[PDB]
Amino acid sequence: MAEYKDNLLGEANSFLEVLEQVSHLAPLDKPVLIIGERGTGKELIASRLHYLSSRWQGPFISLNCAALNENLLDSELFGHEAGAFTGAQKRHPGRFERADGGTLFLDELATAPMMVQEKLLRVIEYGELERVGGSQPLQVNVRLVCATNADLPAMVNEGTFRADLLDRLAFDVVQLPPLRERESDIMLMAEYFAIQMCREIKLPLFPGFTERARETLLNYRWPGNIRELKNVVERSVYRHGTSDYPLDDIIIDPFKRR
DNA sequence: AGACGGCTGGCACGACTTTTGCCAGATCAGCCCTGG
Numbered sequence A: 001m002a003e004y005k006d007n008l009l010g011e012a013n014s015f016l017e018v019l020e021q022v023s024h025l026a027p028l029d030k031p032v033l034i035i036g037e038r039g040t041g042k043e044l045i046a047s048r049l050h051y052l053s054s055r056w057q058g059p060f061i062s063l064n065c066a067a068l069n070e071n072l073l074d075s076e077l078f079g080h081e082a083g084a085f086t087g088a089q090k091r092h093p094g095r096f097e098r099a100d101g102g103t104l105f106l107d108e109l110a111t112a113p114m115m116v117q118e119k120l121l122r123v124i125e126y127g128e129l130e131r132v133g134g135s136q137p138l139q140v141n142v143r144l145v146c147a148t149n150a151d152l153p154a155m156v157n158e159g160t161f162r163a164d165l166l167d168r169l170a171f172d173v174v175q176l177p178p179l180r181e182r183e184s185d186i187m188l189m190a191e192y193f194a195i196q197m198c199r200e201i202k203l204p205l206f207p208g209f210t211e212r213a214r215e216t217l218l219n220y221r222w223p224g225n226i227r228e229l230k231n232v233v234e235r236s237v238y239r240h241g242t243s244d245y246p247l248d249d250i251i252i253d254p255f256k257r258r
Numbered sequence B: 001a002g003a004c005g006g007c008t009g010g011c012a013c014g015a016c017t018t019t020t021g022c023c024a025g026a027t028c029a030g031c032c033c034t035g036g
């Protein structure tokens, strides 16, 4: 509900439309898909969805679907009421349940193994997750929001990703425009990144931007995303020096031998 | 008198019991120090 303090810096007149779209999704409990490319700041949008929802007071755990162990999947997702030691007074909590009352964020959906895919598909459709041991089903209420950069229709075509959980979890998608599509906010991000760098390196003052530098970073196909642009500025501002002259040289990729 | 049947015990082979040998840590509550 309360707008958390985050950097979205939106002026592209397309990012504003995406922001309105996600704001419309803020109250609803329906599953949400975030579609983007490398970088693109999808995590900020996901945090925006969770943190402007009715259940925002709830927790906001975010699991890395690539990071879950294969064998330990069941206990990791559910937990075991039995303690680690004899006569234990408590148990470890699984990924699920630890999310109840709030949203669960999923990332790298495409690279999730088939074991994760099939185990996660069963739990969402019905809930009633049961920890290993005992016969007591616990009912859960968790919002799911996920972000990915690969092409899950192609993943379905190859069959390396099950289409059923996709269909269940594809109520609505939000499209994120690439930085090259935005092509208007580059000045403001460049400047904000440079100002942050000024304090990080403890440089005294920002020198300024030359027209040649503006032309070169503007006239770029930008396969890299906002973070690639961020790193670019980071490299050039440091290589420039102590701001006695305006910033003049931009190195697009630090790989050319020279 | 010799062979046949019978009785008993040692040894062996699964199947199941029972005997010992493991060696802390995290977590919570009250008191003391310190900031408002």
Ligand SMILES: Nc1ncnc2c1ncn2[C@@H]1O[C@H](COP(=O)(O)OP(=O)(O)O)[C@@H](O)[C@H]1O
Binding pocket: A007, A008, A009, A010, A037, A038, A039, A040, A041, A042, A043, A044, A147, A149, A226, A227
């Ligand atoms: N609007 C924005 N404001 C501030 N930073 C941004 C914005 N968009 C992108 N970024 C930067 O780009 C990065 C994208 O990270 P992330 O969303 O994790 O990429 P991916 O979704 O591919 O994993 C973030 O670390 C963030 O610092």
